[PDB]
């Protein structure tokens, strides 16, 4: 009976499909490509680094 | 009896008017929010909340 009241509803309805349609495809969309990221390729450069840091010559 | 001039009776329809139509001020508000949320951050942060001074020592 109060029709701004309603449209806050159908503002608040549009934001559920957003997040339906969003937040499922976007988590495993990450799960799948978290060995790809930019962290691992680092951590494996730096424990090369290190490795041959330690073993060396003067 | 009660005889109002019209010009009083055509400021109150208006006054209600404005009113009804002051309740929808709110639900844009909301769906600029809502949408252009980013530009939102950057106002309120870089404004109303200035960032720090200092700087990192590296
Ligand atoms: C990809 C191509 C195909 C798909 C395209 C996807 C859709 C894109 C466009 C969607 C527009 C929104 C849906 C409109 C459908 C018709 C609704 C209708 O008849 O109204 C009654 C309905 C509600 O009427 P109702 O009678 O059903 O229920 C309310 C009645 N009471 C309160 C009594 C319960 O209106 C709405 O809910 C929203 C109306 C919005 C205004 C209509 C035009 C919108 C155009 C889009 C841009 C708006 C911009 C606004 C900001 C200014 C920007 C400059
Ligand atoms: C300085 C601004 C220049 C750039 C232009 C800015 C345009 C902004 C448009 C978007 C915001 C609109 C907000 C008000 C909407 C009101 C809708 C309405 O119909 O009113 C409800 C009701 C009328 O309900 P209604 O249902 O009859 O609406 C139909 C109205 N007619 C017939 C005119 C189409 O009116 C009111 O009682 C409220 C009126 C509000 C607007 C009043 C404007 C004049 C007084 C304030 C401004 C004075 C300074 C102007 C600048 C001069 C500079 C020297
Ligand atoms: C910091 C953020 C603070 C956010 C706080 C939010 C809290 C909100 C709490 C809401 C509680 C519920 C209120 C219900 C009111 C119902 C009124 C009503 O009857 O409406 C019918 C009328 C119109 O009625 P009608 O004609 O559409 O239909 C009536 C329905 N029947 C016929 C069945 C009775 O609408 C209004 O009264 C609308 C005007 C009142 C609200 C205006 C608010 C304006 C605020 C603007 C934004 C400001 C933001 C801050 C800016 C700061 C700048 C520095």
Redesign the interface.
Known sequence: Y???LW??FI?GTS?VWFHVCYDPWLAIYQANNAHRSLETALTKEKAHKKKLAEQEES | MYLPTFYKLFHETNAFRLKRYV??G??LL??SI?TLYPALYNMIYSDFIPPERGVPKR
């Open positions: 109060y029709p701004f449209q806050f503002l934001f | 309740g929808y709110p639900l909301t769906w809502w």
